């Protein structure tokens with residue numbers, strides 16, 4: 001989680017899509033969904049990201065509807081966007097024990113308890129926080145099943161990106177859980 005406002009430059013794909021849903025939160029606009037193999041993935045937009053400007057205009061106070069209408073009306077040879085990096089999230093690094101554990105339980109992405117004498121415990125991992133990424137890989141929508149499988153195959157240093165549940169539940173409302181599952185970019189980044 002950088003302390004960074006950065007500029008990204010986008011390009012509507014062949015069908016006029018950039019692959020992005022936006023959500024009004026606290027008079028800001030946030031990334032609710034980055035679609036896999038989209039403009040928005042290639043430039044490296046991330047769930048939770050904040051969109052400060054779109055073509056040099058401020059997003060402050062915009063409805064979701066307007067953000068989306070703004071995107072459609074734009075001449076997608078070049079869309080500029082000014083981004084604040086995942087501002088509602090934090091990253092925690094942890095090391096697995098010899099039993100491979102980091103030392104928590106989660107349910108529906110959400111960390112529900114912490115296990116005494118663990119790295120989870122040593123590192124002040126918190127409950128009531130949804131899991132957003134792991135070692136930099138979006139994991140929103142996947143079954144708990146599949147998130148366990150990522151954790152097991154991670155190596156010792158595991159890196160988790162969390163978000164307060166209340167904020168998380170506020171971001172994803174009005175998005176059908178299957179769209180999340182199939183269409184949210186769960187892929188490692190291209191170079």
Ligand SMILES: O=C(NCCc1ccc(O)cc1)c1ccccn1
Pocket residue numbers: 065066068069072
């Ligand atoms: O993209 C537009 N609106 C955002 C999508 C939408 C949301 C709600 C609604 O009721 C209808 C459309 C648009 C495009 C041309 C003229 C006006 N609006």
